[PDB]
Write a protein that binds this ligand. Structure first.
Ligand SMILES: CCCC[C@H](N)P(=O)(O)O
Ligand SMILES: [Mn+2]
Ligand SMILES: [Mn+2]
Ligand code: NA
Length: 261
């Protein structure tokens, strides 16, 4: 759908809150901390300080407030008091906040303690693939072209793109049309128009693209157990580009990307 200026302003607020959760949790992602504790810190912040709520809790039965995925886990990892972070781990924390009826969805990678060279490379390439897609967003571009670009870059850098999960429209609804694939698919044909709001959240594996879902129905891992990384941002298509609604201080790309001269 096409969001109104009123809707977009509310999404700026929700997106900003989601981003602030990631900025707040940063110092706590240390060796020895449990993912269960990280989840409580995030939830307490969202509820008590932001006066908002997690869109994850209860969604199709999801049991926690945020998703925390470690190493070979591709996405939707479930916070657990018994799971402790250790040196070398690459960790994704995915946050989705609802404020004033609108959603803000974002995630980033954190490397615990001493980074491994391939771990850093995978995360760097993954974020760059997101940035590349963000710089392409503007009315007239087709989602298929964006997906194709992400895939071309990821594969050119020696990695693979997860196919089963994708970005999505977002607003008063957690997931709305359209589907935002991170690869080139014949199924995709969506010409971007100003007012559209959606997420881009590429999942990149160091090894092969195939994944597997655990018995809990949420935890997704790489079939070959290789590392997997992901970064996500929520955006709105503007008259001549896009505006990132979940930008953080550590992002190295501006919030407004205009293609004007
Ligand atoms: C509880 C479900 C988690 C939803 C994730 N934010 P995404 O839709 O970005 O994978
Ligand atoms: Mn997310
Ligand atoms: Mn999402
Ligand atoms: Na991972």
């Amino acid at each position: 759908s096409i969001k109104t200026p009123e809707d977009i302003e509310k999404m700026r607020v929700a997106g900003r809150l989601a981003a602030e959760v990631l900025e707040m949790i940063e110092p706590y992602v240390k060796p020895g901390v449990s993912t269960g504790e990280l989840d409580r810190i995030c939830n307490d912040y969202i509820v008590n300080e932001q006066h908002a709520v997690s869109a994850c809790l209860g969604y199709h039965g999801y049991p926690k407030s945020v998703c925390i995925s470690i190493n070979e886990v591709v996405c939707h990892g479930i916070p657990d008091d018994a799971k402790l972070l250790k040196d070398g781990d690459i960790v994704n924390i995915d946050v989705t906040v609802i404020k004033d009826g609108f959603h803000g969805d974002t995630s980033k990678m954190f490397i615990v303690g001493k980074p491994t060279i391939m771990g850093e490379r995978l995360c760097r390439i993954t974020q760059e693939s997101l940035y590349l897609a963000l710089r392409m967003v503007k009315p007239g571009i087709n989602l298929r072209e964006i997906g194709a670009a992400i895939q071309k870059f990821v594969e050119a850098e020696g990695f693979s793109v997860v196919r089963e999960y994708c970005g999505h429209g977002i607003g008063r609804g957690f997931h709305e049309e359209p589907q935002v694939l991170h690869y080139d698919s014949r199924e995709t044909n969506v010409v971007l128009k100003p007012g559209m709001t959606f997420t881009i959240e590429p999942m990149v594996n160091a090894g092969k693209k195939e994944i597997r879902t655990m018995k809990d129905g949420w935890t997704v891992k790489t079939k070959d157990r290789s590392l997997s990384a992901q970064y996500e941002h929520t955006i709105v298509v503007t008259d001549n580009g896009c505006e990132i609604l979940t930008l953080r201080k550590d992002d190295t790309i501006p919030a407004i990307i205009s293609h004007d001269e």
